[PDB]
Amino acid sequence: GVQVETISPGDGRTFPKRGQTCVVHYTGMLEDGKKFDSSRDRNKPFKFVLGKQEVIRGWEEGVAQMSVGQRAKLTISPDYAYGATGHPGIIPPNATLIFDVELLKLE
Ligand SMILES: CO[C@H]1C[C@@H]2CC[C@@H](C)[C@@](O)(O2)C(=O)C(=O)N2CCCC[C@H]2C(=O)O[C@H]([C@H](C)C[C@@H]2CC[C@@H](O)[C@H](OC)C2)CC(=O)[C@H](C)/C=C(\C)[C@@H](O)[C@@H](OC)C(=O)[C@H](C)C[C@H](C)/C=C/C=C/C=C/1C
Numbered sequence: 723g724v725q726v727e728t729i730s731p732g733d734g735r736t737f738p739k740r741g742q743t744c745v746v747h748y749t750g751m752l753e754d755g756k757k758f759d760s761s762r763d764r765n766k767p768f769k770f771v772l773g774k775q776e777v778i779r780g781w782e783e784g785v786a787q788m789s790v791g792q793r794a795k796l797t798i799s800p801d802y803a804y805g806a807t808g809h810p811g812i813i814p815p816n817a818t819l820i821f822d823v824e825l826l827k828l829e
Contacts, residue, residue, distance in 0.1 A: 724780035725797045732792025732825065740773025743829040744785055753797065753818040767826055778803050785825060793824040 738744050745767045749760040761768045770776045772786060780798030788794055800806070800816045808815045 723799060724784040724802050726784050726787055727795045727797075728792065729795055729822065730791070730793040730824075732789030734789050736790040736828065737788070738772050738786055738825075738828055740786075741771065743769050743771050745769050745826045745829060746785070747824045747826065749822045751820050752813070753820050755817075758812055769829070780819070781821070781823075784821075785823060788823070788825045790825055790827055793822070796821045796823055 746769075747761050747767055749757060749762060751757040770781075772782065775782070778798070780796060780802035783802070784794075784796040784798070798819045798821070800818060803819045804813050804817065806815050808817060813819070
């Protein structure tokens with residue numbers, strides 16, 4: 723599944739609803755592995771609509787329990803991420819992923 727561990731607390735009040743646009747900064751890495759992406763390096767926040775299956779399952783269920791301002795470590799098992807196929811050319815089969823995610827605001 724996805725384990726959410728808090729790095730910095732959010733407001734504890736404003737949680738995303740399905741259909742809202744979530745605005746975040748993230749860094750992704752393979753568990754005990756290489757870092758493969760970071761929006762911080764580009765300083766362009768990443769945006770996605772919650773509930774529409776635009777992103778992997780671990781983000782759908784992990785960010786839905788975060789409040790605005792929260793920063794958290796999400797550890798996501800292969801079946802909540804790219805599973806047995808991986809993501810062509812970047813993520814191998816059966817990879818556990820770790821993301822540092824900061825929920826900046828909702829739109
Ligand atoms: C250049 O950087 C990429 C992001 C890269 C891709 C490679 C991976 C290692 C990675 O580095 O991100 C990464 O760190 C990662 O694993 N991410 C991105 C952050 C959210 C979590 C995860 C993910 O789910 O990626 C996603 C993953 C790779 C594929 C999806 C996983 C879930 C599944 O349900 C989807 O099928 C529908 C496919 C990529 C995304 O977050 C982007 C936003 C979404 C898509 C491309 C699809 O949902 C697409 O459907 C056709 C859409 O409906 C979109 C909105 C349509 C518009 C025009 C296209 C936007 C494209 C922007 C893409 C961006 C910024």
